[PDB]
């Protein structure tokens, strides 16, 4: 079935005057609630956000009002709260009794700036979810190229239900990830000017299972059959994996275990779990599920074998 | 504020003051203080907003006469985790101290997530005393910090000299910090640690060191605390 | 006054010359305190080298104390003999490479083959003896040349790590903070001027109009 | 490197170059080389002991030290020149029947230098 | 004949009237193309441009004009690029018919030193030659001090032509010693972080050529009998000199000898090149070529019997 059943669009462009600028994301969050009220689950993208606060700014050098900032309005954090707000899980107004939610996904765009801008800064305030870019990664040509240090998302707490149901080793599996991309990236901070030659094996471990995240889990391309849409078991699944293969190494250099050498010896099962995300999610998930548990298996008893 | 010190200097009651999210309250003040035809200060707060922190913060403390006091713990957001952001720079000009918590340390899975190393507090030494929580109170934070410090830095020296190149001091202050940052700082979310209850926290976690690595420390009170 | 580093100032510029300026702070006291590692093991290998030097004298002559002995139950020179009866290496250095305070310096371990012997089985027991004798001594010397050798990599690793040190502080650092003191002190200041310059001008014509008006 | 025997260069006395010979020496079968190289005092040339020198250290590749047995006292310079790199050589000057005193060693004396 | 009787002067000191400042550059450039319309080649000098611009920001500040960049009028631009233009070779009105031209040369005097500031990126984009001068270099007594990295002229391809009439490997020469200089500030602002070891030989020949060229080619004294003024053959003749010097250094170098002894025993050549400049223009064309031809024979046997 075509999106289009399933979607109304705004389209304003640059050609159009400000005021219809300013009121297109108005016009799309009152169809948004709208639908919402009829128990619908409704999901609200507004590109180019900042072209909104463009907007407002331009409207405001008419009426010549003092803006705050760099020239701003002052009522920018005040509007961009209202409008996020009218987002939300919702109870219908009317009977019978509904359950609609509308979700807004707002892009900002950067402006030279990439945090410094007034809207960005509202927004980090406001919104609840945050995925910031990374210019580095664009720059390196990763996509997506969203920065994992200053995004956040803060219903990670409020999730722990959702996970406790269905995947429940979800939250401390993200929270490991977390923690090896922060360790990894402060060591790769003071090993830039260093050298690689002083850091133990556990260092070089969690540099490289870094990498290995970074280039196999958090990238994806987003026009392959595969992973143009990851379901949110495959990603389970892959992070159990990418898990398992660190904190299996890390216990196999606990021992005596050379991990130069090691490396080599499990490149095999480097190279099936960097592919694990070649899965087909198509296949469905019960044998998806079934082939992920192989690859654990294969994982754990080859690092056992690699260990003595 | 006001109900704070209504409660405290008239019905002489000890009044917590817990104020969330300074930062918003500058934004409110940037709005307002634009809505009217006003100059924008430096990064468009207003140009008065030293007197407002001020005159919000300073409604704390005891009082002569009144038997009450406030102690008031505003908190405040980063807008990008610099000090010299107009809102922290003035907060740290009015209040007394601060605490820290550590964007780094969070990511790293711990709560509660306040950096000890940057973090201090202005007025540390009257509430430490013998009738004051305990004795041993000041000793063992100092040395503390101290332990932890080593840690820290020994832990940074870990990528550019190896583990074998340190001295019983690193080795002893990388499980130290390990072991303080794992069981010390992080604290449950609904645990209630009461000040004696986290001195001997403290206390068995600095039981680490034979009594003569503890520098910081004085004799009289490693004779009376070392040995449980 | 001072350098600048020619960069256009923009307040994106100024985040990297913090940024970077921190860097090189962290990066001075990193290499700063690894350099005084190197140095305290340099001191070490250097007096060393010195106890081991004065001591080989006294070994060398030793050895050849021994070596004139075994000519004395010889009676002949066996220095011809024994130069011309060298087959192969019975005694090799194993160069391999240790991790001394993150250097990779390489030392030297002997290769003692006993199945060799080739100048073994020539001359009278006094040549055995010395040959033993003199084995301890190249052992030895084999240990002051390893010791050597890893003096001379240390000096040359101290030396780099030092003059990037010194050089970095003096120059780098010393021109990052101009640069930053630069950027804000003119750059900043003088938009933040002349925008409150344009804008002092627009509320003064705003005022005076709304006064006539008025 | 390719793990080497000692080199053996000794032109102020062959009583150290034969001792180190009875401990142990190596000669190339094919080549019909040989690492010792010693030298009778007044009869062999600065620039032949030069030579050697050059042939051994920076000619030849392997992974050896080169005693010098004090005869580098005339050959002072080429020392020097060749201490510059720690491999594929590294020099040493043993005691020959002449004493070696520590004045006089390139090593000792860089040594002195960065006290 | 006395060169004043081809001068005419327009003049207004600092402490007089700010806003004649304007009358003074506007009557000088029409007497220029006055004189021009009689077919001479006639070259017009504006002391201070930048004294212009502040008068027409003094003027716009006392009418209460908004401000440009730093106080400046809006129109400085407009004003400069119009005044500039009426340069140019161009042929007369009415007959008989001549050529003239006008060849403005104008200076300008940023503010602390910065070519940051409106009047000069004005300026910058509208002239065809930037003669941009160095602090660092007039401070330590090098002149004409200019900063050769930063300075270019866009008449290089246009003057091809009359190069191959008169001085055919002018322009090869000029390329060559601008690529020298390039290639000796490149190395210089690396060799003062990493030491003067680890250097190549031709690298040093570089940076040694390179500073000869900057101690005795750039520098001009002017006042002195042989630095007043260096004729245009004179000039070639020079860089001829010193290209030759470099390509033979260069090419012995690359044929077995090693720089630190070939320069101590071709020393008297390197301080014959240095001394070449000393050479008076004055001694007639003819007589200083025959000069530069000795130079440069005895330099090329010179550097056959370093050789060897």
């Known amino acids: ?308 | 504020l006001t109900t704070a010190e209504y409660l405290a200097y008239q019905t002489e009651r000890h009044v917590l003051t817990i104020l969330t999210d300074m930062s918003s309250y500058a934004d409110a003040l940037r709005e307002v203080s634009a809505a009217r035809e006003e100059v924008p200060g430096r990064r468009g707060y207003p140009g008065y907003m030293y007197t407002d922190l001020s005159t919000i913060y300073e409604r704390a403390g005891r009082v002569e006469g009144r038997n009450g006091s406030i102690t008031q713990i505003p908190i405040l957001t980063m807008p990008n985790d610099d000090i010299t952001h107009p809102i922290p720079d003035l907060t740290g000009y009015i209040t007394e101290g601060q605490i820290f918590v550590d964007r780094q340390l969070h990511n790293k899975g711990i709560y509660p997530p306040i950096n000890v190393l940057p973090s201090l507090s202005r007025l540390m030494k009257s509430a430490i005393g013998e009738g004051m929580t305990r004795k041993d109170h000041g000793d063992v934070s100092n040395q503390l910090y101290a332990k932890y410090a080593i840690g820290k830095d020994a832990a940074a020296m870990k990528a550019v000299v190896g583990e074998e190149a340190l001295s019983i001091e690193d080795k002893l202050s990388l499980e130290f910090l390990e072991k303080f940052e794992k069981t010390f700082i992080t604290q449950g979310a609904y645990e209630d640690r009461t000040v004696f209850e986290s001195l001997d926290q403290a206390w068995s976690l600095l039981r680490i060191y034979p009594k003569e690595m503890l520098n910081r420390i004085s004799p009289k009170i490693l004779d009376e605390f070392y040995d449980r | 006054s001072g350098n600048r580093e020619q960069v256009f100032p923009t307040r994106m510029t100024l985040g990297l010359m913090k940024t970077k300026l921190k860097g090189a702070n962290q990066g001075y006291s990193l290499l700063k305190r690894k350099s005084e590692a190197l140095t305290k093991r340099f001191r070490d290998i250097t007096k060393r080298i010195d106890d081991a030097k004065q001591k080989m004298g006294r070994v060398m002559q030793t050895a050849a104390f021994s070596l004139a002995e075994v000519s004395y139950a010889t009676g002949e020179n066996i220095g011809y003999q024994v130069q011309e009866s060298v087959s192969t290496a019975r005694f090799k250095v194993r160069a391999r490479q240790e991790n001394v305070s993150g250097v990779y310096l390489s030392q030297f371990e002997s290769y003692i083959d006993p199945e060799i012997n080739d100048f073994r089985l020539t001359g009278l027991g006094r040549g055995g003896q010395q040959v033993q004798r003199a084995k301890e001594i190249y052992s030895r010397a084999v240990e002051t040349l390893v010791e050597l050798a890893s003096l001379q990599t240390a000096f040359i690793i101290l030396d780099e790590v030092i003059k990037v040190t010194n050089r970095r502080v003096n120059a780098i650092e010393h021109v990052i903070i101009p640069r930053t003191e630069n950027t804000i002190a003119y750059i900043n200041s003088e938009l933040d001027e002349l925008d409150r310059e344009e804008f002092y001008r627009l509320k003064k014509v705003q005022e005076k109009k709304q006064n006539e008006t008025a | 490197a390719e793990k080497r025997t000692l080199i053996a260069v000794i032109a102020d006395e062959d009583t150290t170059t034969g001792l180190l010979l009875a401990g142990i020496g190596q000669i190339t079968p094919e080549t019909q080389e040989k690492n010792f190289f010693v030298y009778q005092e007044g009869k062999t040339t600065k620039e032949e002991i030069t030579d050697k020198f050059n042939h051994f250290t920076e000619e030849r590749d392997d992974i050896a030290i080169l005693l010098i047995n004090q005869h580098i006292a005339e050959n002072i310079r080429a020392r020097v020149d060749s201490f510059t790199n720690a491999f594929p050589a590294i020099l040493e000057i043993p005691s020959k029947d002449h004493p070696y005193d520590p004045e006089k060693d390139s090593v000792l004396k860089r040594v002195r230098k960065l006290f």
Chains 1, 5 share one sequence.
């Open chain 1, 1 to 308: 079935e075509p999106i289009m059943k399933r979607t109304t669009l705004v389209a304003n462009t640059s050609n159009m005057p400000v005021a219809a600028r300013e009121a297109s994301i108005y016009t799309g969050i009152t169809l948004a609630e709208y639908f919402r009220d009829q128990g619908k689950n409704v999901s609200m993208i507004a590109d180019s956000s900042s072209r909104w606060a463009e907007a407002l700014r331009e409207i405001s050098g008419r009426l010549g009002e003092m803006p705050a900032d760099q020239g701003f309005p002052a009522y920018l954090g005040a509007k961009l709260a209202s409008f996020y707000e009218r987002a939300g899980k919702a109870v219908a107004l009317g009977s019978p009794d509904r359950t609609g939610s509308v979700s807004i996904v707002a892009a900002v765009s950067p402006a030279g700036g990439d945090f410094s801008d007034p809207v960005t800064t509202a927004t980090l305030g406001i919104t609840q979810v945050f995925w910031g870019l990374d210019k580095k990664l664009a720059q390196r040509k990763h996509f997506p190229s969203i920065n994992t240090s200053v995004s956040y998302s803060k219903y990670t707490n409020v999730l722990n239900k959702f996970y406790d149901s269905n995947y429940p080793e979800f939250p401390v599996l993200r929270d490991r990830m977390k923690e090896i991309l922060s360790n990894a990236e402060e060591l790769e901070q003071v090993v830039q000017l260093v050298g690689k030659s002083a850091l133990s094996d556990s260092d070089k471990i969690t540099l490289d299972v870094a990498t290995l995240i970074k280039e196999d889990f958090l990238q994806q391309n987003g026009y392959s059959t595969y992973d143009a849409f990851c379901p949110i078991w495959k990603t389970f699944d892959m992070m159990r994996a990418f898990i398992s293969y660190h904190d299996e190494a890390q216990k196999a250099v606990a021992n005596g275990a050379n991990w130069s050498k090691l490396a080599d010896s499990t490149g095999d099962v480097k190279h099936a779990v960097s592919s694990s995300k070649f899965f087909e999610p198509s296949r469905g998930e019960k044998e998806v599920h079934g082939e992920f548990e192989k690859l654990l298996s294969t994982m754990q008893e080859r690092f056992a074998e690699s260990t003595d």
